[PDB]
Amino acid sequence: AIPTNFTISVTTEILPVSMTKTSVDCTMYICGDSTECSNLLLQYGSFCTQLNRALTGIAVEQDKNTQEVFAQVKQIYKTPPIKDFGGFNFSQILPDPSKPSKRSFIEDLLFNKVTAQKFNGLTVLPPLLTDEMIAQYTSALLAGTITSGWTFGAGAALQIPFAMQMAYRFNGIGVTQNVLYENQKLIANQFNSAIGKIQDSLSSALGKLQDVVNQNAQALNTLVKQLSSNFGAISSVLNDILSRLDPPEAEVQIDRLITGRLQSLQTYVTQQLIRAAEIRASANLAATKMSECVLGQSKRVDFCGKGYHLMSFPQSAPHGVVFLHVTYVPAQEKNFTTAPAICHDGKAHFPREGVFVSNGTHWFVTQRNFYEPQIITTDNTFVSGNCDVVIGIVNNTVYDPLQPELD
Amino acid sequence: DVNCNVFQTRAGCLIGAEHVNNSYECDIPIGAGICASYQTSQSIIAYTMSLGAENSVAYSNNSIAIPTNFTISVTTEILPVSMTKTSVDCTMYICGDSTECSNLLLQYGSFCT
Amino acid sequence: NTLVKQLSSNFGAISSVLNDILSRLDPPEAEVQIDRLITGRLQSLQTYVTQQLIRAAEIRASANLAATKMSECVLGQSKRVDFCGKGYHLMSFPQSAPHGVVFLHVTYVPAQEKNFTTAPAICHDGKAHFPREGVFVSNGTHWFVTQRNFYEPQIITTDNTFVSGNCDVVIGIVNNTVYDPLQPELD
């Protein structure tokens, strides 16, 4: 079965990058307005050290994963003024110059798609990179891919027309380059129509990015119920017990409140450390595709989408990244009578990269990538032994192109 | 989270740094896109962080850049493999020289396992 | 060093040493103080062991990452873009290190480059000649063919290109006469 028709499709991959940050104090959470609650906590001072150093380790880990996915090169690439690519419309991935933000029309559609606590000590650490620095790193990769392809991520920036960048992608899988020039207008219409199908689908919530915010908000709401918990006492507020009893007798109730809150703190911090392994594993997975699918052409089967990968177009996303791959999946195919080898004058002719086919009347030779009927020549095959050793072999006369060139 | 060389920044309120109209690389991370440094004598100043040099080759359908010179470089990668090992006893750490501390620990014997 | 401070911690008692309490009080009344010391130390043990297990995932993830480059960058040539250094990887030289490993890759990064007038295809006698692995360039006077890897000016021959259709289907195509190396070999 030799493929006779191809279809260009776009694969969208959603992989999270990092999450939010939250710093919790050791003393403020346990005691709000008391003096004797600042005395019994000194005995458990070694527990706050293991918690303060753990919260700082998460803030430096989520910020480090951002510098490994969106920060790959050290050069800023601007958009060229010439918008000529042979027919491929790239106005949807480039940022709008009229709007003050550095985000394109696709980035704003995905940003709006994914839709009081500091009084107790639940503060939020401000991030490093803002919304303008994340969109700038994504715009530099889109401008460098259409002008260089793969030299901007491994060395100096080299200019190259877009008509030649597409031909260099099919040569890595076996497809010839003459098919692109003979059907350049056909792919230009299928590529623009594929963007409209994805645009209409993403405009009508991302489950891979919404669950990240839900798990972070669920952990903050869990500590709210811990504040009103008595942990086997008569009141959760430590000011109500001291206002009705004496210190020497109420010391057994404050100890149960401090010990009960430490169980929730050791569970909340451990829960964030266990979930940090899933974020770190997803960060290295997203950073791998950034340097392989986007930068250059990855030869890994089923890694940069579904099918033969060509190029990629990374986009920005709140607490995540959006991947846009260009796969190559054939469409229609035809069946032909295949021939393993051809015996001529006692010599078995073996092909180099193609295979002999037959339509019922003649015998042609073509590759296993696209239908390209040619003629039987001597420069495309080679002899190897006789015809008595090959199991399956047919018989066909060689045209011999060099013999006429002599008459 | 305190609202306010007085400088009203977006991430907080830094008192002790003069704001300049220039932009350089990031030296000390602060937050919300704030990078502090110690430059010009020299004092602690605050400015807006940069993103690198802005340059791009103009697109042309009749030009190509062919490399004419190469340079061999050596890249050093440092990746850890393993760490140290430490064994902690269940009874010795909890009790050093006592008899009744070897009786109450039997009730919590499932934790040592 | 964290477990050192745990030894002197009272955990809400009067003394961290369990021998000082029994030396001044009676067993039937001091049993409520020993239980608080044992329970307080179990919290540090369940935290120290859990901390080592969580950090073990980062060491295991770094071990499989270092073992991957050992069998790909060092052993053979890995075709993965940006994995065995920065640029085109050739070979590697692993070294030893205390509690770690040192990798020494040999990258291939170009230096200077020149610009030339590129040609997509060449029309001769009504046939469009397409290259196999190179691209036609021009220095302003002649038309040479070379690959996109290194500057190697050659001549226009028939064994390096192939015909595919006419010259009315290609969008961009120039005009240049083929030298035809096989025709002289006959005179």
Task: Please tell me which residue of chain A has the smallest CA distance to C165.
Answer: A182
* Amino acid at site A269: V
**Is there a contact between A7 and A187 (Cβ–Cβ < 8 Å)?**
no
**C-alpha closest to that of C59 among A54, B80, A57, B85:** B80
**Is there a contact between A316 and A132 (Cβ–Cβ < 8 Å)?**
no
Whether residue B29 and residue A128 make contact (CB cut-off 8 A), yes or no, is yes
Task: Please tell me which residue of chain B has the smallest CA distance to A135.
Answer: B51
- CA distance linking residue B22 with residue A281, whole number of Å: 39
The neighbouring-strand residues paired with A8 are A328
- CA distance linking residue A292 with residue A297, whole number of Å: 6
- Which residues on B lie below 8 Å from A80 (Cβ)? 56-59
**C-alpha closest to that of B26 among B8, B47, B56, B53:** B47
- Residues A145, A150, A152, A153, Cα dihedral to 10°: 110
- CA distance linking residue C98 with residue A351, whole number of Å: 54
By what technique were these coordinates determined?
cryo-EM
Q: Which helix (H) or strand (E) holds A169?
A: helix A162-170
Interior/surface letters C36-64, b for 16+ CB within 10 angstroms, e for the rest? ebbebbbbbbebbeeeeeeeeeeeeebbe
CB proximity A158 to B under 8 Å: yes
Pairing of the two strands B64-67 and C113-116:
antiparallel
> Residue C149 has which token pair?
């890897």
Cα–Cα distance list, A263 to A40, A119, A273 (Å):
16, 21, 16
**Is there a contact between C78 and C72 (Cβ–Cβ < 8 Å)?**
yes
CB proximity C149 to B under 8 Å: yes
Interface test with B, best of C6, C107, C145 (most B CBs within 10 A): C107
Out of B71, B97, B111, whose CB is closest to C42? Answer: B111
- Which residues on B lie below 8 Å from A118 (Cβ)? 1
Q: Kindly report the nearest CA distance between residue B62 and chain A, in angstroms.
A: 7
Q: Which helix (H) or strand (E) holds A355?
A: strand A354-358
Provide the phi-psi class of A296: left if phi over 0, else alpha when psi is between -120 and 50, else beta: left
Q: Kindly report the nearest CA distance between residue A72 and chain B, in angstroms.
A: 12
Interface test with C, best of A39, A46, A69 (most C CBs within 10 A): A46
CB proximity A227 to B under 8 Å: no
Q: Which helix (H) or strand (E) holds B23?
A: strand B18-24
Whether residue A154 and residue C82 make contact (CB cut-off 8 A), yes or no, is yes
Pairing of the two strands C122-123 and C174-175:
parallel
Q: Which helix (H) or strand (E) holds C135?
A: strand C134-138
The neighbouring-strand residues paired with A351 are A381
Helices H / strands E in chain B, number of each: 2, 8
Out of B65, B67, B76, whose CB is closest to C102? Answer: B76
HSE (side-chain half, CA atoms, 13 Å) at A36: 17
Q: Kindly report the nearest CA distance between residue A87 and chain B, in angstroms.
A: 13
**C-alpha closest to that of C2 among A261, B86, A75, A340:** B86
Query: DSSP 3-state assignment of C162?
Result: strand
**Residues 62-101 (B) with a CB less than 8 A from some CB of A:** 62-65, 67
Interior/surface letters C108-131, b for 16+ CB within 10 angstroms, e for the rest? ebbeebeebebbbbbbbeebbbbb
DSSP A128: S
Query: DSSP 3-state assignment of C117?
Result: coil
Query: What's the per-residue H, E or C state across chain C?
Result: CHHHHHHCCCCCCCCCCHHHHHHHCCHHHHHHHHHHHHHHHHHHHHHHHHHHHHHHHHHHHHHHHHHHHHHHHHCCCCCCCCCCCCCEEEEECCEEECCEEEEEEEEEEECCEEEECCECCEECCCCEEEECCEEEEECCCCEEEEECCCCCCCCCCCCCEEECCCCCCCCCCEECCCCCCCCHHHC
- Which residues on C lie below 8 Å from B77 (Cβ)? 69, 85, 102-105
Task: Please tell me which residue of chain A has the smallest CA distance to B54.
Answer: A76
- Which residues on B lie below 8 Å from C109 (Cβ)? 70-71, 73
Task: Please tell me which residue of chain B has the smallest CA distance to A76.
Answer: B54
Size of interface A-B (CB pairs under 8 A): 79
Question: Residue B13's CB: how many other CB atoms inside 10 A?
Answer: 12
Pairing of the two strands A6-15 and A122-123:
unpaired
* Amino acid at site A91: S
CB proximity C1 to B under 8 Å: no
**Which is it for the CA torsion A214, A216, A218, A224, positive or negative?**
negative
- CA distance linking residue A40 with residue A234, whole number of Å: 19
- CA distance linking residue C181 with residue C187, whole number of Å: 12
Whether residue B53 and residue A79 make contact (CB cut-off 8 A), yes or no, is no
CB proximity B104 to C under 8 Å: yes
Whether residue C104 and residue B74 make contact (CB cut-off 8 A), yes or no, is yes
Query: DSSP 3-state assignment of A3?
Result: strand
The CA-based angle A265-A271-A276, given to 5 degrees, is 130
Q: Resolution limit in angstroms?
A: 5.4
Provide the edge-to-edge strand list for the sheet that holds C122-123: C161-163, C128-131, C122-123, C174-175
CB proximity A28 to B under 8 Å: no
CB proximity A64 to B under 8 Å: no
What length is written for chain C?
187
Cα–Cα distance list, C46 to A42, A47, A55, B111, B113 (Å):
21, 12, 18, 9, 12
